[PDB]
From a paper:
[name] ([name]) catalyzes the non-oxidative decarboxylation of ferulic acid to produce 4-vinylguaiacol. To understand the detailed mechanism of action of [name] from [name], we cloned and expressed the [name] gene in E. coli BL21 (DE3) and solved the crystal structures of [name] and [name] in complex with a substrate analog sodium ferulate. The cylinder-shaped monomer of [name] had an overall dimension of 25×25×45 Å and is composed of nine β-strands, two α-helices and two η-helices. The [name] molecule could be divided into three independent components: the core, a helical bottom, and a C terminal extension.
The crystal structures were determined to 2.4 Å and 2.1 Å resolutions respectively for the pure [name] and [name] complexed with sodium ferulate. There were two molecules in one asymmetric unit with a Matthews coefficient of 2.6 at 46% solvent content. The result was consistent with the dimerization state of [name], which was first observed in gel-filtration chromatography and supported further by crosslinking with ethylene glycolbis. The results also suggested that the biologically active form for [name] was a homodimer. The core was formed by anti-parallel β1 to β9, which together form an open-ended β-barrel. The helical bottom, composed of α1, α2 and η1, η2, was located at the bottom of the core β-barrel. The catalytic center was located between the core β-barrel and the helical bottom and was surrounded by α2, β8, β9, and the hair-pins between β1/2 and β3/4. The C terminal extension, which contained a long coil with η2 in the middle, was located behind β9. Comparison of the crystal structures of pure [name] and [name] in complex with sodium ferulate revealed that an active hydrophobic pocket was formed when [name] crystals were soaked in a solution containing sodium ferulate. In the closed form, the two hair-pins moved towards β9 by about 5 Å to seal the pocket and shield the substrate away from the catalytic center.
Residue numbers in the entry: 5 to 166
Amino acid sequence: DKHDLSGFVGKHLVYTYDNGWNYEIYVKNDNTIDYRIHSGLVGNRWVKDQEAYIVRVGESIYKISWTEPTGTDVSLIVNLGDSLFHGTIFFPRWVMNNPEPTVCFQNDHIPLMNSYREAGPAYPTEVIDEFATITFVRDCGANNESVIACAASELPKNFPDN
């Protein structure tokens, strides 16, 4: 059944892009995620309660897609059976130009982001398209507010320490 997000809702995942960029996702429910970026262009950025379109595309392969307040588009592939992760991120020109002003707990700064989104140049878009190694998987149940509750810099040095 393609409409059964059963095996994916509650998923907490750590994974490293072929470019070295390190990222972490928590699938909060059938339309919501939390995430926390640990390194790369926008390292330390993190985000609770991002509306996402979440679907099943294979027995155990799921897709998540969403749009940011910054103008960024994301579409991710998590293959749980084969342990394969694929991410495409379309960033606006100004994020590439100035990544450091997207770096924050976004929830405190959503009108700031909308501001940058209409000033710095939208275009041309940077497509960053990349495979990642899933470094950790876990299930944490639905609506769990405490999976992603601080910045990555606040975590043990270590993280994971499970």
